[PDB]
Structure formats: structure tokens, C-alpha cells
């Protein structure tokens, strides 16, 4: 399933797209890379736009 997350860290700003079976896996995959990249804090996501959102 096509999935995109906006990595809006405090200073680390970056947009990213990816794939995954469901949204839970995408969020996990995004969370990992986001965490791996040192990005996390706020975690928002919508099903209408089908896009993920994060911010520190």
C-alpha cells in the first residue's frame, strides 16, 4: 500500500514516501527510519489523505 510521511523534525525537515501491506507496518517502517534518523515526538496520520505526519 503506497504510504508517505512528512518528517518535520524540529530542525530535521524531510519528506519521504514508502510502501507496506497495511498502515501499521508503514507507520512502523516510517517510525523506525524516523527514529533511526533521530526524528519523532509528535505522530499524526489520517486515512482520508492516506498520508503520515510527524514532528518534534
Alpha carbon 40 to its chain centroid, in Å, reads 9
- Cβ density class 7-40: b for 16+ within 10 Å, e for less: bbbeeeeeebeeeeeeeeebbebbbeebeeeebe
Whether 4 and 26 have beta carbons less than 8 Å apart is answered as no
Residue 41 dihedral angles phi and psi, to the nearest 5°: 95, -90
On the 0-12 / 13-18 / 19+ scale of CB atoms within 10 A, 55 is middle
Whether 27 and 52 have beta carbons less than 8 Å apart is answered as yes
Q: Domain holding 19: CATH number?
A: 3.10.20.10
> Which grid cell sits at 51?
498520508
| Structural domain harbouring 39 | 1-56
How many separate domains does the chain show?
1
Amino acid at each position: 500500500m503506497t504510504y508517505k510521511l512528512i518528517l518535520n523534525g524540529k530542525t530535521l525537515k524531510g519528506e519521504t514516501t514508502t510502501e507496506a501491506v497495511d498502515a501499521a507496518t508503514a507507520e512502523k517502517v516510517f517510525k523506525q527510519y524516523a527514529n533511526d534518523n533521530g526524528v519523532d515526538g509528535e505522530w499524526t496520520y489520517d486515512a482520508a489523505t492516506k498520508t503520515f505526519t510527524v514532528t518534534e
